[PDB]
Nucleic acid binder design. Structure first.
Ligand SMILES: COC(=O)c1cc2c3c(cc(O)c2[nH]1)N(C(=O)c1cc2cc(OC)c(OC)c(OC)c2[nH]1)C[C@H]3Cn1cnc(N)c2ncnc1-2
Ligand SMILES: [Ca+2]
Ligand SMILES: [Ca+2]
Length: 227
DNA sequence: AGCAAGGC
DNA sequence: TGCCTTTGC
């Protein structure tokens, strides 16, 4: 049972605003991996802000505590709220928090949580500490956990001109033989997105290195008509 | 605004 | 495959 007051207050308030009619289709959207209260993002963020306006944002010493308790609650809105809350502590998040973010990636894993954790929080950390990438990314690739593997792919998603091109292409080469839907998809996504910044090197990579057909199609879908 | 980004 | 709903922007 949760025990930090902020989290109790958020559980009560969210629970009071649940909508069973919305809950079933939302849960089916995540392949019924999670229970849902039935609260979509606009309302969900309104309710979180209510609790902050009342209690004020907890002291930074408790932010791991609070995220952990939210992660253990059964309804998916609490993990999504936990990530909205982590956004409000970005300034105090640093390399000592990488193992905590790993734990979050590998617990209650699905595309909605991992796609929020990785490009923003891990992306930011490794931009400040790129000498730590080698302690984590190779481990994640070798782990055979698809969510850590998608993390290795997507932590650079938002980098644009900051992208470490040879690192990106090494990561993809290590994972291109994956059968996994969420790995193939992530490879096609990061290539398509980086092609908005550096289209010529994405074209050259795709034309000379093996990829799942899904990944290759998605990567070139906006630039193929220039070639 | 409006368009770009899982489900089926 | 490409359109849907929702969220990100
Ligand atoms: C049933 O409803 C839920 O329960 C629920 C839906 C849902 C969604 C989430 C997250 C959730 O938690 C959701 N929950 N979305 C994102 O995380 C996200 C958007 C985004 C945009 C970007 O461009 C502007 C971008 O890059 C810059 C991103 O990367 C950071 C993006 N990420 C989008 C949407 C799910 N969806 C819908 N229709 C499509 N056609 C989609 N194609 C892909 N995904 C789609
Ligand atoms: Ca392997
Ligand atoms: Ca899609």
């Amino acid at each position: 049972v949760p025990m930090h007051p902020f989290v109790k207050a958020l559980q009560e308030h969210f629970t009071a605003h649940q909508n069973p009619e919305k809950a079933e289709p939302m849960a089916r959207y995540m392949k019924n991996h999670f229970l849902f209260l039935g609260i979509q993002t606009p309302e969900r963020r309104q309710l979180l802000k209510d609790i902050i306006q009342i209690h004020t944002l907890p002291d930074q010493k408790d932010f791991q505590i609070i995220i952990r308790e939210l992660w253990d609650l059964p309804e998916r809105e609490f993990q999504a709220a936990a990530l909205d809350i982590m956004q409000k502590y970005k300034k105090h998040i640093n390399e000592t928090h990488i193992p905590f973010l790993e734990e979050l990636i590998v617990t209650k894993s699905w595309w909605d949580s991992v796609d929020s954790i990785v490009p923003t929080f891990l992306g930011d950390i490794f931009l400040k500490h790129p000498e730590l990438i080698s302690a984590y990314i190779p481990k994640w690739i070798a782990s055979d956990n698809i969510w850590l593997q998608r993390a290795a792919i997507l932590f650079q998603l938002k980098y644009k001109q900051k992208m470490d091109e040879e690192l990106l292409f090494w990561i993809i080469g290590q994972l291109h033989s994956s059968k996994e839907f969420f790995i193939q998809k992530a490879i096609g996504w990061v290539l398509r997105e980086y092609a908005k910044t550096n289209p010529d090197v994405v074209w050259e990579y795709v034309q000379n290195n093996e990829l799942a057909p899904l990944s290759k199609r998605e990567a070139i879908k906006h630039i193929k008509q220039n070639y």
